[PDB]
Amino acid sequence: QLTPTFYDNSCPNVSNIVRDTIVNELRSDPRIAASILSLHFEDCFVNGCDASILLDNTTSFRTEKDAFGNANSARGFPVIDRMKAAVESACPRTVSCADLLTIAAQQSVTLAGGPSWRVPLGRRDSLQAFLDLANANLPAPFFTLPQLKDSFRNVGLNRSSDLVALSGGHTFGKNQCRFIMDRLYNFSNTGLPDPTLNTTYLQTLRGLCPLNGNLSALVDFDLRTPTIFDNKYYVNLEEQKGLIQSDQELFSSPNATDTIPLVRSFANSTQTFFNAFVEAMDRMGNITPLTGTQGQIRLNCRVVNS
Numbered sequence: 001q002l003t004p005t006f007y008d009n010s011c012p013n014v015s016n017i018v019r020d021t022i023v024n025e026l027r028s029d030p031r032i033a034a035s036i037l038s039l040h041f042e043d044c045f046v047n048g049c050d051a052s053i054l055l056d057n058t059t060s061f062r063t064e065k066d067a068f069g070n071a072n073s074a075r076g077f078p079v080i081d082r083m084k085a086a087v088e089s090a091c092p093r094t095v096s097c098a099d100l101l102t103i104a105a106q107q108s109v110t111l112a113g114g115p116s117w118r119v120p121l122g123r124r125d126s127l128q129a130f131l132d133l134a135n136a137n138l139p140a141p142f143f144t145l146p147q148l149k150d151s152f153r154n155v156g157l158n159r160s161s162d163l164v165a166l167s168g169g170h171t172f173g174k175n176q177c178r179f180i181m182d183r184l185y186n187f188s189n190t191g192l193p194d195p196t197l198n199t200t201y202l203q204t205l206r207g208l209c210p211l212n213g214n215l216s217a218l219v220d221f222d223l224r225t226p227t228i229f230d231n232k233y234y235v236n237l238e239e240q241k242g243l244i245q246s247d248q249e250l251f252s253s254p255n256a257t258d259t260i261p262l263v264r265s266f267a268n269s270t271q272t273f274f275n276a277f278v279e280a281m282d283r284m285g286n287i288t289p290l291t292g293t294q295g296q297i298r299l300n301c302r303v304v305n306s
């Protein structure tokens, strides 16, 4: 029952406040738009988009920020706090952190040159965080295509289009050397690099991520347009230049019969990709939301109301 007009009466300027906050942050951190999108994904894949990922530790439950997929990965929490503080100033106790993060993600995509649309709203905030669920539900860069599909299906995204379109979020942002060392020097204990990685690109990546080098070194997901949200991610895949294993599998996996055509279509048309991304983003944002009087309107994203 989520609706795009949910705040048109209670907080008509919420999207503008959010956009303004992101634009300002971009002045000093060009990577923030990508970071925010990642946070929304991490939120929705664990108990749905309920801002559970924003909660800090409490003696009763551990924060999802300590999840293998979020620890020393997720960022931008201070930026979310800032925009939440701004919205709270404009319209007190009105906009949930869950919705706030959803709008922020959409605005981030648009600000990076992606499609523009109004996301459905009306989500409310969880009363707890789910670390174990996060460790079990979040997909990993070393996942095979069947595992990626299972991961998505497990949270309610049954369509291959959901996986291929949303994976396009990697059209911008950074990844650590840590997650590709296997593809570069010892893939699946074969003692060789991943055969699905373009050999010329392999040399470049090896130069950025030498054996015994800094594993925390950041590398661009998209070698074509690192900070621009476009369909270049898919063009890379067609050339065997996906950065992480999970990226390239969409095009090269023996189980990719249903994903290859989508990859090609998105690489072939920017419009086709943008439509599917919007479609998939809203589906992901529709995963088990708390609505009505369920949950609360958290005043501080970091802790439950007291």
Ligand code: HEM
Pocket: 031, 033, 034, 035, 037, 038, 041, 072, 073, 074, 075, 139, 140, 141, 142, 143, 148, 166, 167, 169, 170, 172, 173, 174, 175, 176, 179, 246
């Ligand atoms: C399909 C499975 C996916 C896997 C295996 C995966 C894996 C990863 C990994 C390993 C990182 C690097 C984290 C770090 O180095 O700290 C990352 C970052 C990121 N992911 Fe994904 N991801 C997936 C899906 C998604 C989805 C669905 C979205 C959004 C629609 C997304 C958006 C991002 C963005 C924007 C970044 C860059 C964040 C930044 O630069 O701060 N990812 N992802």
Ligand SMILES: C[As](C)(=O)[O-]
Pocket: 156, 157, 283, 284, 286, 287, 288
């Ligand atoms: C919860 As759904 C992606 O089937 O609308």
Ligand SMILES: [Ca+2]
Pocket: 042, 043, 044, 045, 046, 047, 048, 049, 050, 051, 052, 053
């Ligand atoms: Ca969540």
Ligand SMILES: [Ca+2]
Pocket: 170, 171, 172, 222, 224, 225, 226, 227, 228, 229, 230, 231, 232, 233
């Ligand atoms: Ca790009």
